[PDB]
């Protein structure tokens, strides 16, 4: 009965646009793609006004289907919602195409936020059995990732810029990036005019990303936290400090890991397909400065990056070797 | 450094419309009417997206002038703002006129919320020197308030409904009431079709209004707290428990008195003309269930209603005799 609910908190982007601090993640497994629809419906019914998706997820049509029904029955209006999608590295140089395909899949006229998914460029390998006739993450027979020979990752954002700045184009309300390092953002700020509204990265008490947080705050860029539970197994719920503070604030570990970000001014997009936990996990734990420092200390002592797939290896921040299991044995 | 700011919290009215939990009050003293303009401008630039005013205040023109300048220089868009105004008992049976007069004074095409200011009806006494050619709060030669003899207070709300329900009238987005008791709300619910989105009343640690809170929650009516500091001399700032919790949560007394309401899901509209205080007092104290009960218990043991003018005496809830100063001895 106490407020705010995390669904009731809105942050301001650097272009003056408000974004709900809590959003639903939709990077669901291939066997569960169609379950996205009921999750989005459940989320919005419980008060979510933010849905995060992507061209690469193959969940856009199910996001679109859920929205269509809530529009039709008068549960929601388009302008009430904040919809994010992303351009995958395979279309690094075909942003316009990526956006139109995303909008068609979503059955929408515009998205609120469009991101560069990775600072990466992939080769375009034909495959009828892929996404839009292309291999999502191409490898050779070795099998190592096939990066585009002529690829410049900033070309994606430059094309994002051009759509955002075109006074005759109303397909986006904001642009941003995902998985960018300080170093890459510096190049972007140096070479580009539009300041990304967000940098969507993995962050949570096992990966506080302190230096990135400080940098982004200094440059008017909001972080969006993905995999806040630690992806598969939700290992972050097992952190003793997380359990302790959840008990103290009379909330679930889920609420605590959400609140960890919102408290620090960070947008958070937990992924779930469970309608019950989606509807229930909306409580706020307003953690003290000392509690945040305790949580952040833990992360620096036991760093774990759960999302670190082979394709990300060329990035100085990513190893490509997945998580370090040695730091989970605390 | 920490979030949410109180400017970042949005509640949902029963018609789906979102209202910012924090609003600027504009019932400013007659000597200081013009100072409202800089206060509104300061508020909006600081992050406020909710301005509360009334036909009766004579501050509408200054609210409108502040808004116009912010619209014109691109600081804000109309749809970003939530604007509330109110119908005074002198126009209890002329809601259309009141609304049009407010809209003219504000320089706006619509208000987000239109309230019945009091469950009262005043006689119309001509005075070219008064507001809209009328005495605001008429007293007879004997000095007593001149109520409309044929007056039914609920007629005001019924006129509000008509404007609200009219598919071809876009002057309002929501309606509600102010200074209503449980009993008056019960008659409203029995006789009318539209559930008031809010009931705006004086409430704070000295006047917790526990029973009204429970009723309104059950019937999906949001409370809006006015005079949260306790009017003249801001006496609530001096409550030992308020200073105590303020220090605990690293916030000012002002912030704590705002947070008291927002934590309980109550909209709050502190009135201020101090631009530096308006800008800085946006911090949130996420009070526990125990600390709120401490504050609410204080109000039950030390009840003080600060807003209680002679004109409200005929209402069972009001005495007309102002604050009980004997409950200020602490």
């Amino acid at each position: 009965m106490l407020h705010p609910k995390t669904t009731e908190i809105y942050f301001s982007l650097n272009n003056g646009v408000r974004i709900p601090a809590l959003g639903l993640g939709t990077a669901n497994p291939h066997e569960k793609l169609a379950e996205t629809k009921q999750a989005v419906k459940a989320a919005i019914k419980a008060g979510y006004r933010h849905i995060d998706t992507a061209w690469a997820y193959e969940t856009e049509p199910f996001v679109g289907e859920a929205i269509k029904e809530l529009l039709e029955d008068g549960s929601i209006k388009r302008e009430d919602l904040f919809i994010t999608t992303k351009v995958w590295p395979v279309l690094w140089d075909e942003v316009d195409r990526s956006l139109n395909e995303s909008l068609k899949a979503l059955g929408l006229e515009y998205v609120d936020l469009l991101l560069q998914h990775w600072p990466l460029c992939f080769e375009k390998i034909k495959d009828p059995k892929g996404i839009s006739g292309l291999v999502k993450t191409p490898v050779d027979d070795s099998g190592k990732t096939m990066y585009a020979a002529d690829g410049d990752y900033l070309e994606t954002y430059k094309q994002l810029e051009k759509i955002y700045l075109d006074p005759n184009d109303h397909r986006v309300r904001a642009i941003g990036v995902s998985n960018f390092s300080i170093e890459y953002l510096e190049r972007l700020i140096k070479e580009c005019r539009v300041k990304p509204t967000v940098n969507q990265v993995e962050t949570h008490p096992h990966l506080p990303q302190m230096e990135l947080r400080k940098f982004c705050f200094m440059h008017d860029i909001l972080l969006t936290a993905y995999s806040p539970l630690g992806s598969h197994g939700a290992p972050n719920l097992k952190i003793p400090l997380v359990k302790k503070l959840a008990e103290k604030y009379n909330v679930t570990g889920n609420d605590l890991l959400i609140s960890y970000h919102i408290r620090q001014g960070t947008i958070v997009i937990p992924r779930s397909l469970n309608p019950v936990r989606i509807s229930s996990s909306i409580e706020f734990a307003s953690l003290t400065k000392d509690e945040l420092q305790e949580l952040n200390d833990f992360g620096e002592k036991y760093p774990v990056r759960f999302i670190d797939e082979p394709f990300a290896a060329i990035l100085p921040e990513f190893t490509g070797n997945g998580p370090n299991l040695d730091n989970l044995k605390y």
Side-chain angles (χ1 to χ4, degrees), chain A:
Chain A
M1 208 163 161
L2 303 192
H3 294 254
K5 307 300 183 192
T6 43
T7 52
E8 292 172 334
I9 302 167
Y10 289 71
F11 295 153
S12 290
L13 300 180
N14 63 42
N15 63 349
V17 167
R18 306 203 298 261
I19 184 178
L22 181 68
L24 179 68
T26 65
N28 298 306
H30 192 88
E31 63 277 0
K32 306 169 180 291
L33 296 175
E35 296 179 32
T36 303
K37 184 187 172 187
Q38 61 81 33
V40 174
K41 286 199 82 168
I44 296 174
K45 283 194 162 307
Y48 277 67
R49 294 296 179 267
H50 174 184
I51 308 292
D52 177 281
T53 190
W55 185 94
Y57 297 167
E58 303 185 63
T59 61
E60 283 170 340
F62 304 111
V63 176
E65 211 184 333
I67 296 167
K68 187 186 166 77
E69 292 181 351
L70 295 166
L71 292 175
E72 273 192 275
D73 77 0
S75 294
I76 211 65
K77 292 166 192 181
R78 173 62 186 97
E79 60 261 40
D80 295 333
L81 296 169
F82 192 104
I83 306 300
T84 301
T85 195
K86 314 186 194 79
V87 185
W88 191 246
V90 298
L91 297 182
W92 65 279
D93 61 343
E94 290 174 22
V95 167
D96 187 62
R97 174 183 167 187
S98 186
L99 175 52
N100 289 335
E101 290 182 9
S102 283
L103 287 173
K104 186 194 183 176
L106 294 160
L108 298 171
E109 298 158 77
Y110 75 98
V111 296
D112 300 83
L113 182 56
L114 184 60
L115 310 180
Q116 179 169 358
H117 210 143
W118 287 89
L120 296 162
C121 309
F122 295 169
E123 290 284 3
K124 294 170 177 61
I125 310 308
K126 282 177 280 187
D127 185 347
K129 232 171 279 200
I131 310 170
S132 175
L134 299 169
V135 178
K136 177 194 180 172
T137 307
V139 295
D140 53 30
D141 45 44
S142 296
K144 298 296 209 298
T145 305
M146 300 183 80
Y147 306 105
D150 62 305
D152 177 13
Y153 72 90
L154 264 194
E155 173 65 17
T156 309
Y157 192 79
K158 282 172 179 168
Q159 290 183 11
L160 288 168
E161 275 197 323
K162 289 177 171 165
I163 290 171
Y164 175 78
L165 295 170
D166 185 2
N168 289 333
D169 197 335
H170 305 283
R171 294 174 298 169
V172 304
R173 299 293 179 269
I175 58 173
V177 298
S178 185
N179 300 298
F180 269 54
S181 60
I182 291 169
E183 180 185 291
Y184 281 27
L185 288 169
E186 283 185 341
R187 196 198 151 197
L188 190 155
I189 293 162
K190 174 168 70 75
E191 291 189 5
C192 301
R193 300 160 211 87
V194 185
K195 191 77 70 58
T197 57
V198 306
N199 181 26
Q200 190 181 115
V201 299
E202 178 191 357
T203 177
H204 45 76
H206 260 303
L207 200 73
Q209 303 257 218
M210 297 303 284
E211 301 289 359
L212 187 61
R213 289 177 178 279
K214 292 174 198 175
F215 178 88
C216 292
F217 181 83
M218 283 177 70
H219 282 93
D220 211 5
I221 305 166
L222 296 182
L223 283 204
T224 299
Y226 73 73
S227 293
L229 294 194
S231 187
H232 306 136
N236 292 345
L237 297 171
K238 285 157 202 153
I239 299 160
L241 195 49
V242 167
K243 294 197 287 180
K244 183 224 276 194
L245 294 172
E247 192 180 78
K248 191 203 172 207
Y249 285 84
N250 193 53
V251 299
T252 61
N254 299 249
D255 297 316
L256 197 99
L257 292 168
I258 289 166
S259 300
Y260 167 74
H261 299 295
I262 292 170
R263 184 60 170 158
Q264 291 183 116
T266 303
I267 309 148
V268 62
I269 52 156
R271 184 190 69 84
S272 176
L273 288 168
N274 183 347
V276 173
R277 222 171 309 166
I278 287 161
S279 301
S280 171
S281 308
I282 58 170
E283 304 306 325
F284 188 60
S286 197
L287 306 162
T288 61
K289 168 200 169 70
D290 290 324
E291 282 157 357
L292 292 172
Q293 193 54 237
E294 261 195 280
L295 275 49
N296 290 335
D297 279 0
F298 178 87
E300 216 70 68
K301 192 173 180 169
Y302 308 97
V304 181
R305 185 186 290 271
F306 298 98
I307 310 302
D308 200 348
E309 300 192 74
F311 72 84
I314 49 163
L315 305 173
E317 31 179 18
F318 290 83
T319 66
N321 304 315
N324 178 281
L325 281 78
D326 271 286
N327 288 338
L328 292 162
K329 301 288 278 78
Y330 39 82

